[PDB]
Structures are given as structure tokens and as C-alpha cells.
Amino acid sequence: SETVVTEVLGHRVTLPCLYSSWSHNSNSMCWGKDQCPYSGCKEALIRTDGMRVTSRKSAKYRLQGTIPRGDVSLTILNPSESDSGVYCCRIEVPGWFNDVKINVRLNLQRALV
Ligand SMILES: [Ca+2]
Structure with missing residues (x-):
């Protein structure tokens, strides 16, 4: 089950992920490219604790x-x-x-001409 996002052609783009029951005392998350990161969320694109980002692959x-x-x-x-x-x-x-896995496929294109 994935959401498809299409963007042509560039400056910034957002990939949706919502977990409404989130608790800062229980939850944390991370994003990964191509595959879901493993339990523990190490080596990911970006990662949070219950409150804030705590590291990322780059800016x-x-x-x-x-x-x-x-x-x-x-x-x-x-x-x-x-x-x-x-x-x-x-x-x-x-x-x-019991971790929740949400997938987004990003289609990043350019205009055809
Ligand atoms: Ca778990």
C-alpha cells in the first residue's frame, strides 16, 4: 500500500506520512530510500525521537x-x-x-517539450 506523488520539475517536494495517535513518550520514526529502514532506525535519511529530528543523512x-x-x-x-x-x-x-510502514513512491520528472 503506497501513495504516489508526482512532481515536475523542482525546488522542494513533500512526501506525506501521518501517525495521528503519536505520543512523544512512545514514538519515534525514520525515513528510508528504496526499502524501509530496519527496527532501530539506524542508517536512514532522517530520524526523530518523540519530539524532534535527531540526525539526518544531509540537509x-x-x-x-x-x-x-x-x-x-x-x-x-x-x-x-x-x-x-x-x-x-x-x-x-x-x-x-508492530512498527507501522508507510510507503510513498516519488515520481520526479521534468517537462517534455
Ligand atoms: Ca516496535
């Missing part, structure tokens, strides 16, 4: 919504062709075998 990735409300959509600055493809938003939920 190209932002989270602008309220993280304590589960607005964890990824903003990608200056996106380009290689930014296309599958992305996965992994919600970390207490317990095992």
Missing part, C-alpha cells in the same frame, strides 16, 4: 510538521531525477513486530 531532508502530533512527512529540498523512487516512513511503536 536536503527536513521535517516541517509537528512531530509530537505525528506530522512526520519528509520534505526534500531541491529534488532531482535521482531523488525518484520508493521511500518508506517507519513509525516505531513499543513492542516487537
